[PDB]
Amino acid sequence: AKKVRFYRNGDRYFKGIVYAVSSDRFRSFDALLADLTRSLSDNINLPQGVRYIYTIDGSRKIGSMDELEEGESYVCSSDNFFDDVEYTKNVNPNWS
Amino acid sequence: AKKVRFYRNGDRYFKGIVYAVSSDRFRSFDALLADLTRSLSDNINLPQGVRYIYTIDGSRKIGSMDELEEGESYVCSSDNFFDDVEYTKNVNPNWS
Hints:
1 helix; alpha+beta; about 10% helix; Ubiquitin-like (UB roll); transferase; 5 strands; 4-stranded mixed beta sheet; homodimer; globular
């Protein structure tokens, strides 16, 4: 199975969560967005859960699991617009 | 000249500042630490400025500019101990 990292729109501090994505573990794209809503929404992020998935630079939206690329990052959003913030990842070798 | 990135001890959110390091621009190691104190200290970070420089995983201290390696990251500290936090960098291609 394919691993990809998901971020939440406009959150500069949250470092993403890695998902193993396959048909075995998500029977539909909307089952994936429901799971991303649970793992990514909180009191301050995603007021309507995950409804849109963008590429890391917000150039386009992802509409199916097959568009998801192994090892890339994606930004989950409640909104039909991309927040062009500095998304971040760890550099400390003790943690990655 | 050599570029390296400097972080501040225990700050998970600050993404580092890139320095061009050479003998032309810093006549001594302590001139560099004085410059790092100015660029990195604030009301919440480095209560005694930059007195120690650690490798990104806190395995050892850097004592001279010649130990600094092109393209690596370093953690500046007021204290003789390393804070093993998740230091971070940008992944958004729109910003790097």
